[PDB]
Design a protein around this motif. Structure first.
Motif, PDB file in Angstrom:
ATOM      1  N   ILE A 267       0.740  -1.249  -0.205  1.00 34.97           N
ATOM      2  CA  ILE A 267       0.083   0.103  -0.026  1.00 34.97           C
ATOM      3  C   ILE A 267       0.832   1.313  -0.090  1.00 34.97           C
ATOM      4  N   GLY A 268       0.784   2.146  -0.853  1.00 35.77           N
ATOM      5  CA  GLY A 268       1.299   3.302  -1.054  1.00 35.77           C
ATOM      6  C   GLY A 268       2.687   3.188  -1.709  1.00 35.77           C
ATOM      7  N   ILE A 269       3.005   2.094  -2.628  1.00 34.67           N
ATOM      8  CA  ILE A 269       4.270   2.195  -3.063  1.00 34.67           C
ATOM      9  C   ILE A 269       4.414   2.930  -4.572  1.00 34.67           C
ATOM     10  N   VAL A 270       5.413   3.364  -4.599  1.00 39.51           N
ATOM     11  CA  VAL A 270       5.726   4.665  -5.577  1.00 39.51           C
ATOM     12  C   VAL A 270       6.717   3.967  -6.694  1.00 39.51           C
ATOM     13  N   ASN A 271       6.658   4.451  -7.808  1.00 41.66           N
ATOM     14  CA  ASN A 271       7.183   4.096  -9.076  1.00 41.66           C
ATOM     15  C   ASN A 271       8.638   4.957  -9.132  1.00 41.66           C
ATOM     16  N   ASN A 272       9.699   4.291  -9.200  1.00 43.74           N
ATOM     17  CA  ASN A 272      10.975   4.919  -9.645  1.00 43.74           C
ATOM     18  C   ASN A 272      11.763   3.777 -10.264  1.00 43.74           C
ATOM     19  N   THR A 273      13.090   4.388 -10.151  1.00 46.19           N
ATOM     20  CA  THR A 273      14.183   3.431 -11.225  1.00 46.19           C
ATOM     21  C   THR A 273      15.438   3.009 -10.160  1.00 46.19           C
ATOM     22  N   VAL A 274      15.561   1.606 -10.123  1.00 44.08           N
ATOM     23  CA  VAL A 274      16.505   1.035  -9.364  1.00 44.08           C
ATOM     24  C   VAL A 274      17.722   0.922 -10.150  1.00 44.08           C
ATOM     25  N   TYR A 275      18.864   1.312 -10.021  1.00 48.39           N
ATOM     26  CA  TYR A 275      20.206   1.183 -10.650  1.00 48.39           C
ATOM     27  C   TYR A 275      20.847  -0.279 -10.257  1.00 48.39           C
ATOM     28  N   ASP A 276      21.125  -0.790 -11.250  1.00 48.50           N
ATOM     29  CA  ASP A 276      21.901  -2.067 -11.442  1.00 48.50           C
ATOM     30  C   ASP A 276      23.214  -1.779 -11.434  1.00 48.50           C
ATOM     31  N   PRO A 277      24.179  -2.086 -10.666  1.00 50.57           N
ATOM     32  CA  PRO A 277      25.650  -1.731 -10.828  1.00 50.57           C
ATOM     33  C   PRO A 277      26.493  -2.626 -11.841  1.00 50.57           C
ATOM     34  N   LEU A 278      25.688  -3.978 -11.831  1.00 52.09           N
ATOM     35  CA  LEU A 278      26.210  -4.764 -13.112  1.00 52.09           C
ATOM     36  C   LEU A 278      26.100  -4.548 -14.372  1.00 52.09           C
ATOM     37  N   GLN A 279      24.759  -3.884 -14.754  1.00 50.99           N
ATOM     38  CA  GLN A 279      24.467  -3.467 -16.108  1.00 50.99           C
ATOM     39  C   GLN A 279      25.500  -2.823 -17.022  1.00 50.99           C
ATOM     40  N   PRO A 280      25.985  -1.570 -16.436  1.00 46.79           N
ATOM     41  CA  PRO A 280      27.096  -1.010 -17.261  1.00 46.79           C
ATOM     42  C   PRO A 280      28.490  -1.698 -17.375  1.00 46.79           C
ATOM     43  N   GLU A 281      28.746  -2.574 -16.399  1.00 49.62           N
ATOM     44  CA  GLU A 281      29.944  -3.479 -16.500  1.00 49.62           C
ATOM     45  C   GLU A 281      29.965  -4.411 -17.499  1.00 49.62           C
ATOM     46  N   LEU A 282      28.680  -5.156 -17.763  1.00 45.26           N
ATOM     47  CA  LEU A 282      28.440  -5.855 -18.844  1.00 45.26           C
ATOM     48  C   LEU A 282      28.792  -5.108 -20.441  1.00 45.26           C
ATOM     49  N   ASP A 283      28.066  -3.818 -20.281  1.00 44.24           N
ATOM     50  CA  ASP A 283      27.920  -3.073 -21.421  1.00 44.24           C
ATOM     51  C   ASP A 283      29.221  -2.641 -21.820  1.00 44.24           C
ATOM     52  N   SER A 284      29.854  -2.333 -20.825  1.00 46.89           N
ATOM     53  CA  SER A 284      31.571  -1.778 -20.984  1.00 46.89           C
ATOM     54  C   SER A 284      32.378  -3.141 -21.288  1.00 46.89           C
TER      55      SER A 284
END
Ligand SMILES: *[C@@H]1O[C@H](CO)[C@@H](O[C@@H]2O[C@H](CO)[C@@H](O)[C@H](O)[C@H]2NC(C)=O)[C@H](O)[C@H]1NC(C)=O
Ligand SMILES: *[C@@H]1O[C@H](CO)[C@@H](O[C@@H]2O[C@H](CO)[C@@H](O)[C@H](O)[C@H]2NC(C)=O)[C@H](O)[C@H]1NC(C)=O
Ligand SMILES: *[C@@H]1O[C@H](CO)[C@@H](O)[C@H](O)[C@H]1NC(C)=O
Ligand SMILES: *[C@@H]1O[C@H](CO)[C@@H](O)[C@H](O)[C@H]1NC(C)=O
Lengths: 48, 48
Positions: free
Chosen positions: A31-48
């Motif tokens: 109840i009362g949960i809000v939309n936001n973005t959660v940063y994944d520190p592994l994602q730009p390591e795979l991309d790089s």
């Protein structure tokens, strides 16, 4: 405008990441949960 | 048949992963240790 995670007894804002939060349930239960973005520190390591 | 990790004060079964458990010692020391499979969430991210 931005969301952060800080320690309860002292304001110290940190970027909301998967290493700061844990997953349980979904948005249709909390109840009362809000939309936001959660940063994944592994994602730009795979991309790089 | 399956093994899970849950909080001791409330049954909530979670998949046994490297983010739920820590490594210390080996199987030849602990009494009553059992065989299972520990899931690594990093592996399918590299494979994909
Ligand atoms: C948070 O984001 C979710 C998913 O984008 C929103 O849920 C959608 O909302 C739209 C518009 O109300 C609906 O048409 C979709 O059916 C919803 N999708 C799902 C997966 O339920 C949710 O509304 C957003 N919350 C707020 C307040 O912005
Ligand atoms: C858990 O699995 C390990 C390894 O797969 C088992 O170790 C084997 O044990 C037998 C009998 O003691 C030995 O003969 C083999 O040399 C071992 N194999 C390996 C690969 O080390 C162990 O027995 C299993 N434990 C249980 C509780 O069954
Ligand atoms: C808080 O209460 C207000 C009523 O003043 C309501 O409009 C709002 O949706 C409530 N928010 C939550 C998260 O309960
Ligand atoms: C637990 O007790 C049983 C006897 O019912 C015995 O066979 C087994 O080896 C014991 N295991 C441990 C880890 O003590």
């Amino acid at each position: 405008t931005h969301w952060f995670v800080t320690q309860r007894n002292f304001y110290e804002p940190q970027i909301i990441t998967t290493d700061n939060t844990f997953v349980s349930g979904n948005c249709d239960v909390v109840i009362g949960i809000v939309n936001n973005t959660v940063y994944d520190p592994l994602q730009p390591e795979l991309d790089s």
